[PDB]
Amino acid sequence: SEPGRNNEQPGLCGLSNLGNTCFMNSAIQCLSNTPPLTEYFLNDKYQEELNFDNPLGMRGEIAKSYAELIKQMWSGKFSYVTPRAFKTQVGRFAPQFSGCQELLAFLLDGLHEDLNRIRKKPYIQLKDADGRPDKVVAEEAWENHLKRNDSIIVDIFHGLFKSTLVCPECAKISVTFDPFCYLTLPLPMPKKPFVKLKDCIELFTTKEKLGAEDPWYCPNCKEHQQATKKLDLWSLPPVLVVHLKRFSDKLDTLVDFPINDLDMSEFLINPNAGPCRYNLIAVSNHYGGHYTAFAKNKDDGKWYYFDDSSVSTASEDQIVSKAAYVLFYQRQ
Amino acid sequence: GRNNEQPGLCGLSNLGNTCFMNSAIQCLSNTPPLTEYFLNDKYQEELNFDNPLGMRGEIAKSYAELIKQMWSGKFSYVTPRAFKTQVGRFAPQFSGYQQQDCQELLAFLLDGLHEDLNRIRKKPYIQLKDADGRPDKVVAEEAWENHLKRNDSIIVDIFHGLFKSTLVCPECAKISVTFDPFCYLTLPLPMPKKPFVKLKDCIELFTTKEKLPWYCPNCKEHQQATKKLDLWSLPPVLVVHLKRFSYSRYMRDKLDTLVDFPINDLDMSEFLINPNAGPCRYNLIAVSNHYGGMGGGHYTAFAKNKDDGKWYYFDDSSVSTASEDQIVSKAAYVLFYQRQDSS
Amino acid sequence: SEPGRNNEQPGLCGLSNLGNTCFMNSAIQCLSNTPPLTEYFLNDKYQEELNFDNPLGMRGEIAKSYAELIKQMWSGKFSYVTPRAFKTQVGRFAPQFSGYQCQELLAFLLDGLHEDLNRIRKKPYIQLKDADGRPDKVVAEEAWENHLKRNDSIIVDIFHGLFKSTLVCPECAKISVTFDPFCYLTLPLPMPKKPFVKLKDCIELFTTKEKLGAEDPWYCPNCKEHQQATKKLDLWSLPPVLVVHLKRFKLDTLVDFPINDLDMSEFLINPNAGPCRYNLIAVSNHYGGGGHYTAFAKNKDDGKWYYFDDSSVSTASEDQIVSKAAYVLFYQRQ
Amino acid sequence: GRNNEQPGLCGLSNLGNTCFMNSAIQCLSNTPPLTEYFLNDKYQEELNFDNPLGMRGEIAKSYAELIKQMWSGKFSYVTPRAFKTQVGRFAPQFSQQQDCQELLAFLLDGLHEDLNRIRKKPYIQLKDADGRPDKVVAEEAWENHLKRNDSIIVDIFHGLFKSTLVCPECAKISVTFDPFCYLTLPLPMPKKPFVKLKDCIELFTTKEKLEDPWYCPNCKEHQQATKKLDLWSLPPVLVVHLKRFSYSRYMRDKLDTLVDFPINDLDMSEFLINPNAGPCRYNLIAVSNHYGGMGGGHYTAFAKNKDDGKWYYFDDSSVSTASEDQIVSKAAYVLFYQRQDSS
Amino acid sequence: GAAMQIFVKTLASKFISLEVEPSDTIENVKAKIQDKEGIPPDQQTLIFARKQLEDGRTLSDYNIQKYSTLHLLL
Amino acid sequence: AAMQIFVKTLAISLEVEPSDTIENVKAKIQDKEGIPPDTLIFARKQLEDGRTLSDYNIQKYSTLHLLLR
Amino acid sequence: AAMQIFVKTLASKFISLEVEPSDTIENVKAKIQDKEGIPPDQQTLIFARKQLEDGRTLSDYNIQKYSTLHLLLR
Amino acid sequence: AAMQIFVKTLASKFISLEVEPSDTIENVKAKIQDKEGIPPDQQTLIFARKQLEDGRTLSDYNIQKYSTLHLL
Ligand SMILES: [Zn+2]
Ligand SMILES: [Zn+2]
Ligand SMILES: [Zn+2]
Ligand SMILES: [Zn+2]
């Protein structure tokens, strides 16, 4: 015998609490139930791509530790596992979390660099538009991205939006195309009791004035200026990670999001974007605190609830709640 | 035969010309609520041995024992001799060379399984009535209860739905509206034959008014009325038959049109005229294929295994892995769709 | 040798006040500067189409009176004229606009001009029939032919369009879709009062799902009772001249509207429609008792803007046109 | 010649080979701000008789008197002999044939200098951008221009480019702001049967590789730099020359591409890189046509009459009504556009 | 069969059902309204689509559709 | 009370009760056009002798198909 | 080869620096010390929500020209 | 102060000159004669498709430094 060892359906595996990991366990369950990511590790495709000397990596330890945890969780030999080795690598390379969604951002970037196929990175001078059409600049931006960033993480999670900045003094317009690995959606302010997920996406694409976090130098004004930033979605990844920004004291707003058939087509400004419909595959919940996860199992297609070491059956009707914090969508 | 295998990944050896028996069985075998019902031994208590319209439990009994073999995990294939003999005993039309109307086998199986498991042990005669101007929700409710008073079984629970029938007389122009049950849909293909059509176009055609043996009570006789169908409620498992045989009696003159159908996320909501109907999204779970040839041709099946979620190809006794990208072909004949979250 | 009589540029002609007319003079100036309407009358093209026996008409007197007024106004012999004959026909057939307590004067004039010039001289009775599952493009075309069987005139040619009307029963929840003709749009403004909206926001309010009120009783065929349905309007086709009424009744909201290049494409639910952009040709102003009305108009011959305040006509700049006084906008398709 | 006609509906007799003089006059005659300026005698006080680049006032004087005849309403046609005599005295190049397309440039520049209010011009050291913001450099260029060039022609026809030149060796970038009184648009090569006017404008603003001798100050020799043009400000009247002569000197090898240009509502707004410029929409007021043939071909004009707003066709001495629907043709050569509401 | 059902919204915001033909005059319609609500036709004014139905005209003249609901004012 | 049903020959009306045997209809069939009871079809489904038409829930104004041999 | 970048002070003021893509984060901290007299001991540099670690070059982070780093005092 | 300009021959190689904005075109033709053996009778000087006539200074046409004239 051993605590946690039972013969269970692969992937229906909890994670014991080991101290207080912020949103680690919930984050792992969301990534564990991203089928292209888990299949990549279960098929031993990461050994070929492990990067131990990337200056922005973790000497392969984040990818190695994560892969080995996933193999336990999908082995069918455990009802729950204690992720001590993966937690140790997170605590060693990210002490800021010892003691909140930016852990997911750290993991995506750490997995990316620990598996980055660019094994000596060129310095790339990124370039603004100058009247060139969006398709020329966007294509150019993606190849520049791929010259330094080429990994299973880019293939699965990375997309590109169009960024329009306007100088308050000079009024000059600067257009760049920037990569992203997840979207942070704002909620309406002040609180409404109910909002449609699409309203949050439309808030995301509304012109906003940069704050202290984004000091910007105007090349024309030769002046630092508080520009106006406008974001438009150019291309979307096979798995779209959507963060509901509830902390900016917490907004309990009920964000209604689709379980199936999330159509992003009306938000794509690319006329060559095809139909873009998504199905939900995972949800990280935050209780004002404690984090849990809903996830769809890739093998049986049913929904499950993950509360640390506890795994239980779930219905689609109980997923949409005020606790929803991070949504995982997979392209149809 | 004897093999240490994955449950449900079990072939059915070929036994002459059985119409599409093996292909049909694999489709039903991979309808999870049906297989779970038999694997969990709830059919014994529900066996109906006195049904005037049944096979006094013998079709359901043999089928259950076949499914138990197929999902025991002890076989890579089985020879379904017992089930075939019971089909021949009650439905000789699907025996041997002299085969006729091979598409009615699925209808025979759905109706036969239903009657061998019908919870109504003595059926009342019910006088059906069209709507009389009464609202749709009241009439459709009345029709559904009338159905359930004579027809109550796991087959009704899984496969039965309701459409609305509007009939119009050439003189009186009198409209008579009924709500009629169905256990499968027969979809017409566009005529004249097109090389490519989308599944929704065929569904969109199914609901178009077409002219037919109907006696009009008002004009007081037999006239060629125009019948118009609208789907009111859909079952948890939707069986979709593509009319590929213009000469259905002998599988002659087959339409090879490529019908494009979704593997996932079939949203039927736009076809439901019941506003209070819930979300009706469907995922494909099985496909019966027909390959033309001398004789009645040959049938195979695609099916998704409920346990691993992967697609498999069943050609009689042969079972092999399949990719969803090869499912849509001109060979597709019968589609099995399951409502999202029914299991 | 009369007051008013001077040698002036055609169309730059005022209209004296005769009593105290709601917005007759302002409405006339807007119609007078609708080029296809004025060209039709100035070319003597209405005599053949005068309908004197239409049961919904005015024995041809509204169109005859209007045509003769337009001929005076575009003769170039007057700096202003007294529209006494036309006013008498308005008072005789529409006494409701007499007495000093308004936009349905324009609706009356467009509709009266139509019947006085309706080419259908005995109208068949037609059973209108809603979609019943048929695709939009078949039902819409059918509605237009049904419309033309009773209504065929220069006014239909110039001013009439078609929207889609979707009604939903609150009890029964059944959806019934019709395609209905219109000769002008009444746009709601946001409530409560905002200081600024432009015109597209008002169009989006117009096409927003809408709860029927008291003046719109609706019988549900399924429930076989009256219900308070929710109505939804979507623009199917737009006329060569789109008359846009801003529903201010007062809301002093400043509605920003384009002088040029009003692009209606995003509101057309018809995929087979081409680009639909409009240029402004006239604006009726209301200054708040009962109110006084004036007009801005673009002269068809020289393309310049002018201001019409009863008998006074003066030059105008486009930059003074957009103000909170704008009440009715006239747009002509490019 | 002397008849009672509508002012401005006046032909111009043919006097041998005049390049496109008659067509050029009809286009300028129907540029309302230009004609109103002359008809109201606002040029008398502004005539410059000592301009070193002028014609002792003879071009403006002569042109003014021709315009006065054409808009007096006493002529169905006039013989522009006096104006032709002054054009030949200062521009003999147009009768043999020598780039007939530069006549418009000669007339606009000749009218400008004969009416230049700057009555002794300073020599001004022009001035690169050199890292300073665009609005400061562009305003500086416009004032430098206005200190030597100030006239009704500048008011009506002059705009500003942004010029970015880059040396192939040093990669040095030189930015200047340059005035223009007309635009020469290239057509797509190889010859296409149909192009939109906006496509030609986008080619005009496309960087090309340098018969323009240009010195890189740093890299030490003359180089074939890449030059890129951007429209900074546009004049009230925009003259657009469609470059149809691959062999411009002898008007040979003409490209017959059908250039589709709008009669109304030309929005140049997307081409303005100046953010503080307002909306600039233009309506067409005149078109110079070229018909190929024996020798230099023949030129005519479409023009919109400012008083009645109707289109007319001018073929030397013949004036006839025209429809907007017949204006867009492959004969279109020079387009005159007026900014909406500048009159 | 020519007959059809239309409605009139009374003053109390109740609705009154009538059997009517398209060829019936507005006077006939006002007479049927008196048979059911006891209100003299000289007092009745009928509105549909913001318009009086005027006396002398048929309901075909106004193209009144079946299940139309007129407004009764006094 | 009885009800009216029909059986259409390959190229006809009956009064019947729901409790009638399929044979009563077939016993009517010899009585009908001189056709010995030696096959009745309704709803693409063959009606067996010994069963009532209440067993098949045959409605009034229903039209049966008659085939021979 | 050189380029201009900026750092936002604690006081929300901006410092200009001349830098190569190959210069280490320590060196940039030394240039910040030459200009603001603040020891590299108390310097944390942030760009794009990411802390710049010592030992890496600015090419490692693909720092672009006219980039503005954030300075925080440890 | 004087400045350097160039004139492109037919054979597309240039000649450097010193000239003042106050220099007349006769000098520019004379300086071309002083060093290139080309008498002012021989030459016609063109700039920007607008042709300089004799009697004018280089200031009259606003000839900028490093401007390159065309020689005919
Ligand atoms: Zn700036
Ligand atoms: Zn009938
Ligand atoms: Zn209802
Ligand atoms: Zn150089």
**Residue linked to tokens 């020469």:** D184
- Integer Cα distance of A156 and B26 in angstroms: 35
The token duo for A113 is: 């660099």
- For B296-316, give the secondary structure using H, E and C: CCEEEEEEECCCCCCEEEEEC
> Quick check: is A290 catalytic?
yes
Nearest ligand to the CA atom of B169? 2
- Integer Cα distance of H2 and H16 in angstroms: 13
Neighbours of A209 (CB within 10 A): 11
Give Cα F49 distance to the centre of its chain.
Answer: 10
The token duo for C149 is: 């069987």
CB contact under 8 A, D309 and C302: yes
The token duo for G16 is: 């200009």
- Integer Cα distance of B87 and D342 in angstroms: 90
Closest CA to G45 of G18, G11, G13, G9: G9
- Name the amino acid, one letter, at A50: L
Give the active site residue among B19, B102, B216, B280: B19
List CB contacts of C307: < 8 A, sequence separation 6 or more: C294, C295, C296, C313, C314, C315, C316
Nearest ligand to the CA atom of C171? 3
Structure determination method: X-ray
- Integer Cα distance of D241 and D232 in angstroms: 19
Cα–Cα separations (whole angstroms), residue C23 to A37, C309, C310: 70, 11, 10
**Residue A300 is nearest to which of B281, B283, B307, comparing CB atoms?**
B307
**Residue linked to tokens 């575009």:** C74
Q: Which residues of A touch G62 (CB under 8 A)?
A: 121, 123-124, 148
Cα–Cα separations (whole angstroms), residue E51 to C87, C156, E29: 21, 19, 16
The token duo for E63 is: 């193209």
Q: Please compute, for residue A196, the number of CA atoms within 13 A of its CA located in the half-sphere on the CB side.
A: 5
DSSP state of G42: G
The token duo for C40 is: 């039709």
Instruction: Search chain C and give the residue with CA nearest B132.
Output: C222
- Integer Cα distance of D237 and D181 in angstroms: 9
Site from A8, A299, A329 to mutate, B interface, most B CB atoms within 10 angstroms? A299
- Name the amino acid, one letter, at G38: I
D272 Cα to the center of ligand 1, angstroms: 16
- Name the amino acid, one letter, at D247: Y
* Backbone phi and psi for residue B34, each to the nearest 5 degrees, phi listed first: -70, -45
Secondary structure element (H or E) that encloses residue A155, with its range: helix A152-157
- Integer Cα distance of A281 and A302 in angstroms: 10
Q: Is D126 touching H (CB cutoff 8 A)? A: yes
Q: What is the length of chain A? A: 332
B132 Cα to the center of ligand 2, angstroms: 15
* Backbone phi and psi for residue C192, each to the nearest 5 degrees, phi listed first: -75, 165
The token duo for A261 is: 């058939």
Residues, beta carbon < 5 Å, ion ligand 4: D 167, 169-170, 216, 219
Secondary structure element (H or E) that encloses residue C24, with its range: helix C24-32
Closest CA to B67 of B88, B102, B42, B104: B42
- Integer Cα distance of D6 and C79 in angstroms: 22
F7 Cα to the center of ligand 2, angstroms: 19
- Name the amino acid, one letter, at E15: F
State which residues form the domain around D304: 1-343
Q: What is the length of chain F? A: 69
Neighbours of B302 (CB within 10 A): 30
Q: Reduce the DSSP state of residue F23 to 3 states and report it.
A: helix
Q: What is the length of chain B? A: 343
Nearest ligand to the CA atom of D217? 4
- Integer Cα distance of B124 and F55 in angstroms: 8
Residues A291, A285 contacting (CB under 8 angstroms): yes
| Cα dihedral across residues B53, B55, B60, B61: positive or negative | positive
- Integer Cα distance of F55 and F49 in angstroms: 11
Q: Which residues of A touch D134 (CB under 8 A)?
A: 170, 172, 220
**Residue B135 is nearest to which of C133, C172, C175, comparing CB atoms?**
C172
Give the active site residue among B114, B147, B290, B298: B298
Q: Which residues of G touch A124 (CB under 8 A)?
A: 62
* Backbone phi and psi for residue B159, each to the nearest 5 degrees, phi listed first: -115, -15
CATH number assigned to the domain comprising residue D41: 3.90.70.10
B177 Cα to the center of ligand 3, angstroms: 17
The token duo for B190 is: 């566009």
| E-strand stretches of chain C | 14-15, 80-81, 161-168, 175-182, 185-188, 196-198, 210-211, 218-220, 225-227, 230-237, 241-247, 254-256, 262-263, 277-287, 292-298, 305-309, 312-316, 326-333
Q: Reduce the DSSP state of residue B195 to 3 states and report it.
A: coil
Q: Which residues of B touch C175 (CB under 8 A)?
A: 275
Secondary structure element (H or E) that encloses residue B162, with its range: strand B161-168
List CB contacts of B277: < 8 A, sequence separation 6 or more: B232, B233, B234, B269
Chain C residues within 8 angstroms (CB to CB) of chain B: 133, 172-175, 222-224
Instruction: Search chain A and give the residue with CA nearest D276.
Output: A171
Q: Which residues of B touch C225 (CB under 8 A)?
A: none
Residues, beta carbon < 5 Å, ion ligand 2: B 169, 172, 216, 218-219
Distance between A220 CA and the closest CA of chain D, angstroms: 5
CB contact under 8 A, A224 and G6: yes
Interior angle at CA A222, CA A220 and CA A223, nearest 5: 115
- Integer Cα distance of A31 and A111 in angstroms: 11
Q: Reduce the DSSP state of residue B295 to 3 states and report it.
A: coil
Residues A293, A15 contacting (CB under 8 angstroms): no
CB contact under 8 A, H68 and D215: yes
The token duo for A125 is: 């001078």
- Which B residues 53-112 touch F at CB under 8 Å? 53, 104, 107, 111
Nearest ligand to the CA atom of B224? 2
- In this complex, how many residue pairs, one in chain B and one in chain C, have their CB atoms less than 8 Å apart? 17
Instruction: Search chain D and give the residue with CA nearest C258.
Output: D279
Give Cα B131 distance to the centre of its chain.
Answer: 27
Give the active site residue among C13, C22, C202, C220: C22
Neighbours of A325 (CB within 10 A): 25
Closest CA to C71 of C41, C112, C101: C41
What would the DSSP string read from start to end of C184-229? Answer: -EEEEPPSSPPSEEEHHHHHHHHTS-EE--TT--EEETTTTEEE-P
**Residue B136 is nearest to which of C133, C175, C222, comparing CB atoms?**
C222
Cα–Cα separations (whole angstroms), residue C98 to C21, C110, D286: 7, 18, 50
**Residue F55 is nearest to which of B52, B104, B128, comparing CB atoms?**
B52
Nearest ligand to the CA atom of D216? 4
Helices (H) and strands (E) in chain C, counts: 8, 18
Cα–Cα separations (whole angstroms), residue D215 to A169, H23, H48: 35, 21, 15
Distance between D133 CA and the closest CA of chain A, angstroms: 5
**Residue linked to tokens 């007959």:** E3
- Integer Cα distance of C313 and C307 in angstroms: 6
List CB contacts of B140: < 8 A, sequence separation 6 or more: B162, B164, B179, B232, B233, B274
Burial of C223 from C-beta contacts in 10 A (0-12 / 13-18 / 19+) = middle
* Backbone phi and psi for residue D240, each to the nearest 5 degrees, phi listed first: -120, 115
Give Cα H33 distance to the centre of its chain.
Answer: 11
Give Cα D330 distance to the centre of its chain.
Answer: 19
- Which B residues 195-214 touch F at CB under 8 Å? 213-214
CB contact under 8 A, A224 and G68: yes
CB contact under 8 A, A217 and G66: yes
- Integer Cα distance of B334 and B73 in angstroms: 27
- Integer Cα distance of A138 and E47 in angstroms: 61
- Integer Cα distance of A67 and A82 in angstroms: 14
Q: Which residues of D touch A221 (CB under 8 A)?
A: 133
* Backbone phi and psi for residue A244, each to the nearest 5 degrees, phi listed first: -85, 115
Site from G10, G62, G63 to mutate, A interface, most A CB atoms within 10 angstroms? G62
- For chain D, give the secondary structure using H, E and C: CECCCCCCCCEECCCCCCCCHHHHHHHHHCCHHHHHHHHCCCCCCCCCCCCCCCCCCHHHHHHHHHHHHHCCCCECEECCHHHHHHHHHHCCCCCCCCCCCHHHHHHHHHHHHHCCCCCCCCCCCCCCCCCCCHHHHHHHHHHHHHHHCCCHHHHHHCEEEEEEEECCCCCCEEEEEEEECCEEECCCCCCCCEEEHHHHHHHHCCCEECCCCEECCCCCCEECCEEEEEEEECCCEEEEEECCEEECCCCEEECCCEEECCCCCEECHHHECCCCCCCCEEEEEEEEEEECCCCCCEEEEEEECCCCCCEEEEECCEEEEECHHHCCCCCEEEEEEEECCCC
List CB contacts of E18: < 8 A, sequence separation 6 or more: E5, E6, E7, E8, E29, E32, E33, E36
According to DSSP, the β-strands at B196-198 and B258-260 are parallel
**Phi-psi group of A296: left, alpha or beta (phi > 0 → left; psi -120 to 50 → alpha; rest → beta):** beta
Site from F16, F57, F58 to mutate, B interface, most B CB atoms within 10 angstroms? F57
Cα–Cα separations (whole angstroms), residue H43 to C198, E5, H51: 65, 101, 12
Burial of A311 from C-beta contacts in 10 A (0-12 / 13-18 / 19+) = buried
Neighbours of A317 (CB within 10 A): 9
Residues C321, C259 contacting (CB under 8 angstroms): yes
- Chain gaps in chain D, named by the residue before each (C–N > 2.5 Å): 95, 210
Closest CA to A123 of A94, A150, A148, A87: A148
Closest CA to D233 of D94, D339, D334: D339
According to DSSP, the β-strands at H68-71 and H45-47 are antiparallel
CB contact under 8 A, B133 and C224: yes
| Cα dihedral across residues A7, A13, A18, A19: positive or negative | negative
- Integer Cα distance of H63 and H57 in angstroms: 9
List CB contacts of C28: < 8 A, sequence separation 6 or more: C15, C69, C83, C86
Cα–Cα separations (whole angstroms), residue B169 to A29, B220, C132: 62, 10, 18
The token duo for G45 is: 């540099």
Residues B32, B106 contacting (CB under 8 angstroms): no
B274 Cα to the center of ligand 3, angstroms: 12
Interior angle at CA G53, CA G49 and CA G59, nearest 5: 85
Interior angle at CA B69, CA B67 and CA B73, nearest 5: 115
According to DSSP, the β-strands at H14-19 and H3-8 are antiparallel
- Integer Cα distance of D260 and A13 in angstroms: 67
A232 Cα to the center of ligand 1, angstroms: 22
Q: Reduce the DSSP state of residue G18 to 3 states and report it.
A: strand
Neighbours of B92 (CB within 10 A): 11
- Integer Cα distance of A62 and A91 in angstroms: 11
- Classify each residue of C72-84 as buried b or exposed e, where b means 16 or more C-beta atoms within 10 Å of its C-beta: bbbeeebbbbbbe
CB contact under 8 A, D217 and H66: yes
CB contact under 8 A, G68 and A212: no
* Backbone phi and psi for residue B26, each to the nearest 5 degrees, phi listed first: -65, -35
Domain count, chain D: 1
Q: Which residues of E touch C150 (CB under 8 A)?
A: 63
List CB contacts of C198: < 8 A, sequence separation 6 or more: C255, C256, C257
| Cα dihedral across residues D45, D46, D50, D56: positive or negative | negative
Q: Reduce the DSSP state of residue B259 to 3 states and report it.
A: strand
> Quick check: is A22 catalytic?
yes
Q: Which residues of D touch A173 (CB under 8 A)?
A: 275
Distance between F48 CA and the closest CA of chain B, angstroms: 9
CB contact under 8 A, H60 and D52: yes
Give C188-194's long-range contacts (Cβ < 8 A, gap of 24+).
Answer: C188/C247, C189/C246, C189/C247, C189/C248, C189/C251, C189/C253, C189/C255, C190/C253, C191/C251, C193/C251, C193/C252, C193/C253, C194/C253
- Integer Cα distance of E38 and E40 in angstroms: 7
- Integer Cα distance of C254 and C251 in angstroms: 9
Closest CA to D285 of D22, D34, D11: D34
**Residue linked to tokens 């409502």:** B339
**Cis? peptide before C192, omega within 30° of 0:** yes
Q: Which residues of C touch E14 (CB under 8 A)?
A: none
Neighbours of C242 (CB within 10 A): 22
Residues A108, A94 contacting (CB under 8 angstroms): no
DSSP state of A321: S
